[PDB]
């Protein structure tokens, strides 16, 4: 019975982190 | 220095999980035990109350 | 209870006193900085009754007490009351008598010397503490937050200090001390709630308003837009339960009170607000300092826990700051409780054992010694 | 004294059965709160442990 | 009859006293149920209304 | 139970995504 | 009966109703804010008899009426009784009709907004007034006394306001609204006259006590000395003749009542007295303001007419105030009725004719408009 | 007749002497 706010944002903020982490590694490799 | 911060997160997250569990479980144990107990106390009191009401009616006839 | 002569640590504000022992990462107890006294003539005989009540006693028995705060705008004006607070704070709840343990008390960087001198004198002559130190609140906040650099906003009940520190150095020419604080925000709320039909004029009533503020108020990321809707519709109102079962419903006043931090003119204060106060401290520091201070706006003290304040302070500085530059606020959940924690950190650092004034040096020099030894 | 005691026997017993009833009617309605406020809040907290598992 | 009526009046008075105590306790329990319920339902409405970003 | 799980997970994810994002932005921005 | 559309001016307080037309130097008529109702069953037929009586009618027939005051410590709650008071004030005394005249009413600066909204609503909807303007009592008090700078001490029947104004500007953070008033003195005197063997509890008795207070009371410059002699000798006693021929002799109650203004604890109030609120309202202002406010403490309202009141407050303020600086109370003969006069001054200013809410703007916006149009 | 003549003359003289005295005091105090 998750509250949508917590489920949706925990996953989205988790994804911002994972995506940003991969972007940091990727961009760092480029730079 | 940054190890202090890591130690703080280690204790806070070990505490968080201990707490999510303790917060919930201490209430579920106390609370469900309390209502189960007092649901029974409530029923037993209601039964006794009915029995006393009956006893009072019987004495009134006596 | 203690197995070592650890220093005892307290952060004594115009609001509350946080207390615990050196070496911990949290206070063990909190007391309001209050001493209460009855304003009525006793009629019954044999009901006990104290001449004065301290801390939580003062609030629990407040129905007939006038409640006074011994600390105002960062300093102790009534030290007889602080001695009762300290006995209660150190011995009744923490269970440690200062006689066998060093004590650390705190102050703002420009706090009048008379206050650090009395804090030192009281603990040495009334409590017989073996050693003393009076600490800078900004130092303590930076230790707790893991910083050596940043602007410390200690925005509590008494005074907003606003001091830049870089690589552990004070940058005093850039301090923007401001007589704008949480006590004034409460007074403003009492006046605007009066406009709504709920006048508050007595101590019990004052304490209710401070409770309303702490539970219902916020600053808002964008005040004028938040007010435009809150002042126009019930959809942004929130109720509060008064002690007698009555209720109060509050609209834009819910955020207009906290807004005084950004708009001090609401209380007749000559100020552009806490974000320009912060900005000017960064602005006045050297050009190779500024980048680190823009990236480290440090939140300590009360009011730092209003909803929207961490996001609002970063936005407001960003709006004043040059482009390209990264503006960042240091505002974790452990925000503000950073000053008590720092007191614990400092008291227990191995590099700070020589900084303790012992009750040797103290009696030879007298309390003026704190001005020569603490910093 | 008997009329007063009988009247009081009735009023006191009436108060007893009135209170036993208001108490039952209290407790019974009260246990409903008692059994559902903790179970609702308890299951809410149970659910929270799971609600927060994301 | 009086001793019996006084027994009933006093029995019932002692019993009503106990019942009155049961009510005082019951109401305190009720308040605890309501207050805890209120606190839980509201602490969650507010915790979730403010804690929306995760 | 107020959402204690969230209060801390919230701090964890906001901090972790902000740090990961700061890294993503720097990793590219450093050029 | 007027030959010009002059504004009507009226102070509808918890005590008296003062009214006249703008441009005069005094209200034309003054009477109590009372609507009375029979508390008995009629037995004679063809006796006329109203359901309710107003003002002087309410007092004239009071032997069988219960008397109510629609204004509660400065706010209007019983608007229906006030409609009757206004109708009587305007048509049976001034012989004017609001329909043909703009109307000015007044309230204290921290008076709940509901008061200004309800007064505006009724004058526009039941009296069809072409325009309205709710004035600030503090503004009107200084206009009448001749000051742009000073403290308004409006100590009348409802509430004491205590507001500093400098160069025509409010200094609102320093307002000390206090729940201490002439209305409390009437009830307190009923209780201390009970101590003397003359109990007073009913409306008629309250009106008798209000008359005793108004004719016999004073505060005195030195309370304790006046008390010591009044409590020891008949030489400080004064008699009062009651409506039914009874005579009451009053001693130290003659001043102990009024003294509550300086010692509010007599009625259970948590307050230091009117002289301290005056003092603090000045002390909270900037030092370049204080020099002008201490020299201009200005009296308005009732109780300011008591012998020793201006000297009593000036003495206490002076004792609390710093030396070199001069402290003075302005207490003109136009006392108790000076706010009405201020209303006349405001209503007749050329600079005020743009401040009116017209009966166009009113209907488009509703009564909440007063909150934006007046101040 | 209550002393109406006095009530006003009293206000006149108290105000005039207080003002004159305030002037006397300032005239010297200004140095
Ligand atoms: N979450 C909050 N909401 C509203 N106001 C707050 C909050 N937390 C603290 N404040 C206010 O800050 C003041 C407390 O001052 P404080 O700085 O905490 O003293 P200290 O330095 O010992 O910590 C009080 O006026 C309190 O109302
Ligand atoms: N002889 C008097 N001495 C002192 N006060 C008086 C005297 N006569 C009338 N008053 C008081 O004036 C008060 C009327 O209130 P008022 O001051 O006119 O309202 P406002 O505060 O708006 O000016 C009443 O409490 C009344 O008792």
* C206 CB neighbour count, 10 Å cutoff: 16
- CA G192 to CA G342: how far, in whole Å? 36
Tokens 């009526």, located at residue = E5
Contacts of F6 (CB under 8 A, 6+ apart): A6, A10, D52, E47, E51, E54
Q: Is residue C281 packed enough to be buried (19+ CB in 10 Å), middle (13-18) or exposed (0-12)?
A: buried
Considering every ligand atom shown, identify the ligand nearest to the alpha carbon of residue G105 and give its number: 2
From residue G75, alpha-carbon distances to C182, G227, G302, G368 in Å are 30, 35, 17, 16
- CA F11 to CA D43: how far, in whole Å? 25
Yes or no: say if C253 and C189 are a contact pair by the CB < 8 Å rule: yes
Yes or no: say if C112 and C75 are a contact pair by the CB < 8 Å rule: yes
> What 3-state DSSP class applies to G346?
helix
- CA G31 to CA G89: how far, in whole Å? 9
Contacts of G189 (CB under 8 A, 6+ apart): G209, G212, G213, G217, G253, G257
**3-state SS string for chain C:** CCCCCCCEEEEECCCEEEEEECCCCCCCEEEECCEEEECCCCCCCCCCCCCCEECHHHHHCHHHEEEECCEECCEECCHHHHHHHHHHHHHHHCCCCHHHCCEEEEECCCCCHHHHHHHHHHHHHCCCCCEEEEEEHHHHHHHHHCCCCEEEECCCCCCECCEEEECCEECHHHCCCECCCHHHHHHHHHHHHHHCCCCCCCHHHHHHHHHHHHHHCCCCCCHHHHHHHHCCCHHHCEEEECCCCCEEEECCHHHHHHHCCCCHHHHCCCCCCHHHHHHHHHHCCCHHHHHHHHCCEEEECCCCCCCCHHHHHHHHHHHHCCCCCCCCEECCCCCECHHHHHHHHHHCCHHHHHHCEECCHHHHHCHHHHHHHCC
Closest chain A residue to F14, measured at CA: A13
Please list every protein residue whose CB sits less than 6 Å from any atom of ligand 2. Answer: G 11, 13, 15-16, 137, 154, 156-158, 182, 210, 214, 300-303, 305-306, 336, 339
The best mutation among G10, G144, G206, G303 to test binding of ligand 2, ranked by most ligand atoms within 8 Å of the C-beta, falls on: G303
- CA G138 to CA G170: how far, in whole Å? 10
User: What does the block give as tokens for F12?
Assistant: 């964890």
> What 3-state DSSP class applies to G244?
coil
Phi, psi of G69 (to 5 degrees): -110, 110
**3-state SS string for G50-61:** CCCEECHHHHHC
Q: Which chains touch C (3 or more CB pairs under 8 A)?
A: B, F, G
Phi, psi of G240 (to 5 degrees): -135, 135
Give domain C35-68's CATH architecture.
Roll (2.30)
Count CA within 13 A, CB hemisphere, residue B28: 15
- CA G281 to CA G166: how far, in whole Å? 12
The best mutation among G156, G298, G309 to test binding of ligand 2, ranked by most ligand atoms within 8 Å of the C-beta, falls on: G156
Phi, psi of G150 (to 5 degrees): 160, 180
Residue C294 C-alpha from the chain's centroid: 23
Contacts of G94 (CB under 8 A, 6+ apart): G8, G19, G20, G21, G28, G29
Q: Where are the domains of chain G?
A: 4-34+71-134+337-371, 35-68, 136-181+271-332, 182-267
Considering every ligand atom shown, identify the ligand nearest to the alpha carbon of residue G217 and give its number: 2
Please list every protein residue whose CB sits less than 6 Å from any atom of ligand 1. Answer: C 11, 13, 15-16, 18, 156-157, 182-183, 186, 210, 213-214, 217, 301-303, 305-306, 339
Closest among G148, G153, G248 to G197, alpha carbons compared:
G248
Closest among G136, G31, G3 to G90, alpha carbons compared:
G31
Experimentally determined by: cryo-EM
From residue G93, alpha-carbon distances to C266, G26, G28, G148 in Å are 43, 14, 8, 33
User: What does the block give as tokens for E12?
Assistant: 């019932």
Contacts of A10 (CB under 8 A, 6+ apart): D52, D54, E54, F6, F9, F10, F13
User: What does the block give as tokens for G46?
Assistant: 């063809």
Indicate if the alpha-carbon torsion angle C60, C62, C64, C70 is positive or negative: positive
- CA E1 to CA C124: how far, in whole Å? 78
- CA B38 to CA B36: how far, in whole Å? 6
CB contact, 8 Å: E32 with chain D?
no
Yes or no: say if C97 and C126 are a contact pair by the CB < 8 Å rule: no
Yes or no: say if D25 and E25 are a contact pair by the CB < 8 Å rule: no
Contacts of F7 (CB under 8 A, 6+ apart): C333, E47, E51
- CA C245 to CA B37: how far, in whole Å? 31
Looking at domain C182-267, what is its CATH homologous superfamily?
A: ATPase, substrate binding domain, subdomain 4 (3.90.640.10)
Looking at domain G4-34+71-134+337-371, what is its CATH homologous superfamily?
A: ATPase, nucleotide binding domain (3.30.420.40)
Q: Do chains H and C touch (3 or more CB pairs under 8 A)?
A: no
User: What does the block give as tokens for G111?
Assistant: 């008076």
Helices (H), chain G: 56-60, 79-87, 113-125, 137-145, 182-195, 203-216, 223-230, 253-256, 274-283, 287-293, 309-320, 338-347, 361-365, 370-373
Phi, psi of C12 (to 5 degrees): -100, 100
The verdict on a CB contact (< 8 Å) between A21 and F20 is yes
- CA D30 to CA B38: how far, in whole Å? 10
Yes or no: say if C328 and C321 are a contact pair by the CB < 8 Å rule: no
Indicate if the alpha-carbon torsion angle G33, G35, G39, G40 is positive or negative: positive
Helices (H), G126-181: 137-145
Contacts of E52 (CB under 8 A, 6+ apart): A5, A6, A9
- CA H16 to CA H31: how far, in whole Å? 23
- How many residues would you count in chain A? 31
Q: How far is F24 from chain D (nearest CA, A)?
A: 24
- CA C362 to CA A2: how far, in whole Å? 61
Closest chain E residue to D54, measured at CA: E54
User: What does the block give as tokens for E36?
Assistant: 């805890």
From residue D34, alpha-carbon distances to B40, D22, D29 in Å are 12, 16, 8
* C338 CB neighbour count, 10 Å cutoff: 30
User: What does the block give as tokens for G117?
Assistant: 């909204």
The best mutation among C303, C312, C344 to test binding of ligand 1, ranked by most ligand atoms within 8 Å of the C-beta, falls on: C303
> What 3-state DSSP class applies to G37?
strand
User: In chain G, which residues are followed by a C-to-N distance beyond 2.5 Å, i.e. a gap?
Assistant: none
Yes or no: say if G289 and G171 are a contact pair by the CB < 8 Å rule: yes
The span from the first CA to the last CA of chain G, in angstroms, equals 32
From residue C51, alpha-carbon distances to C17, C81, C82 in Å are 22, 12, 15
CB contact, 8 Å: F2 with chain E?
yes
Q: Report the atom number in ligand 1 closest to the C-alpha of C300.
A: 17
- Do the domains G136-181+271-332 and G4-34+71-134+337-371 match in fold? yes
Radius of gyration of chain H (CA): 13
Resolution in A: 6.6
Yes or no: say if C14 and C184 are a contact pair by the CB < 8 Å rule: no
Q: What are the CB-based long-range contacts (under 8 Å, 24+) for G360-369?
A: G362/G120, G362/G124, G362/G132, G363/G124, G366/G121, G367/G117, G367/G118, G367/G120, G367/G121, G367/G124, G368/G117, G369/G120
Yes or no: say if B59 and E8 are a contact pair by the CB < 8 Å rule: yes
- CA G366 to CA G357: how far, in whole Å? 11
- CA C126 to CA G217: how far, in whole Å? 51
- CA G255 to CA G239: how far, in whole Å? 14
Q: Is residue E23 packed enough to be buried (19+ CB in 10 Å), middle (13-18) or exposed (0-12)?
A: middle
- CA G36 to CA G18: how far, in whole Å? 19
> What 3-state DSSP class applies to A1?
coil
Q: Is residue D30 packed enough to be buried (19+ CB in 10 Å), middle (13-18) or exposed (0-12)?
A: buried
- CA C42 to CA C51: how far, in whole Å? 12
User: What does the block give as tokens for C30?
Assistant: 């909190």
Q: Which chains touch E (3 or more CB pairs under 8 A)?
A: A, B, D, F
Indicate if the alpha-carbon torsion angle H5, H11, H16, H17 is positive or negative: positive
- CA C218 to CA C309: how far, in whole Å? 8
Task: List the single residue in F10, F16, F28 with the smallest CB-CB distance to A17.
Answer: F16
DSSP G94: I
The verdict on a CB contact (< 8 Å) between E22 and B45 is yes
Taking any CB pair shorter than 8 Å as contact, residues of chain B touching chain F are 12-13, 16, 19-20, 23-24, 27
**The CATH fold of domain G136-181+271-332:** Nucleotidyltransferase; domain 5 (3.30.420)
């Amino acid at each position: 019975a998750s509250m949508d706010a917590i489920k949706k944002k925990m996953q989205m903020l988790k994804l911002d982190k994972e995506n940003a982490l991969d972007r940091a590694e990727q961009a760092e490799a480029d730079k | 220095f940054d190890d202090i911060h890591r130690k703080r997160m280690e204790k806070d997250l070990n505490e968080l999980q201990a707490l999510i569990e303790a917060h919930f479980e201490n209430r579920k144990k106390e609370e469900e035990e309390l209502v189960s107990l007092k649901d029974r106390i409530e029923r037993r009191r209601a039964e006794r109350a009915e029995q006393q009401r009956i006893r009072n009616e019987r004495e009134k006839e006596r | 209870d203690e197995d070592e002569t650890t220093a005892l640590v307290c952060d004594n504000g115009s609001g509350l006193v946080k207390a615990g022992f050196a070496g911990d990462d949290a206070p063990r107890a909190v007391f309001p900085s209050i001493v209460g006294r009855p304003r009525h003539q006793g009629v019954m005989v044999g009901m006990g009754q104290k001449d004065s009540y301290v801390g939580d006693e003062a609030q629990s028995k407040r129905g007939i007490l006038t409640l006074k705060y011994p600390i105002e705008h960062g300093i102790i004006t009534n030290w007889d009351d602080m001695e009762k607070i300290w006995h209660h704070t150190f011995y009744n709840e923490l269970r440690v008598a200062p006689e066998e343990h060093p004590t650390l008390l705190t102050e703002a960087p420009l706090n009048p010397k008379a206050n650090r001198e009395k804090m030192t004198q009281i603990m040495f002559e009334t409590f017989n503490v073996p050693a003393m130190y009076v600490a800078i609140q900004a130092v303590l906040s930076l230790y707790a937050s893991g910083r050596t650099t940043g602007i410390v906003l200690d925005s509590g009940d008494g005074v907003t200090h606003n001091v830049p520190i870089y690589e552990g150095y004070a940058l005093p020419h850039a301090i923007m001390r401001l007589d704008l604080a949480g006590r004034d925000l409460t007074d403003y709320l009492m006046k605007i709630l009066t406009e709504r039909g709920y006048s508050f004029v007595t101590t019990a009533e004052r304490e209710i308003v401070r409770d309303i503020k702490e539970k219902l108020c916020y600053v808002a990321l964008d005040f004028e837009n938040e007010m435009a809707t809150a002042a126009s519709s019930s959809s942004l109102e929130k109720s509060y339960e008064l002690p007698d079962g009555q209720v109060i419903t509050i609209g834009n006043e819910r955020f207009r009170c906290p807004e005084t931090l950004f708009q001090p003119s609401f209380i007749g204060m000559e100020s552009a607000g806490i974000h320009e106060t912060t900005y000017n401290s960064i602005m006045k520091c050297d050009i190779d300092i500024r980048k680190d201070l823009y990236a480290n706006n440090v939140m300590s003290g009360g009011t730092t826990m209003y909803p929207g304040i961490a996001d609002r302070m970063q936005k407001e500085i960003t709006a004043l700051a040059p482009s390209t530059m990264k503006i960042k606020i240091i505002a974790p959940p452990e925000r503000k409780y950073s000053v008590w924690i720092g007191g614990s950190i400092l008291a227990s650092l191995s590099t700070f054992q020589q900084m303790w004034i012992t009750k040797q040096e103290y009696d030879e020099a007298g309390p003026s010694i704190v001005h020569r030894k603490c910093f | 004294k008997l009329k007063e005691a009988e009247t009081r026997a009735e009023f006191a017993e009436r108060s007893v059965t009135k209170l036993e009833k208001s108490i039952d009617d209290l407790e019974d309605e009260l246990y409903a709160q008692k059994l559902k406020y903790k179970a609702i809040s308890e299951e809410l907290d149970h659910a929270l442990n799971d609600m927060t598992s994301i």
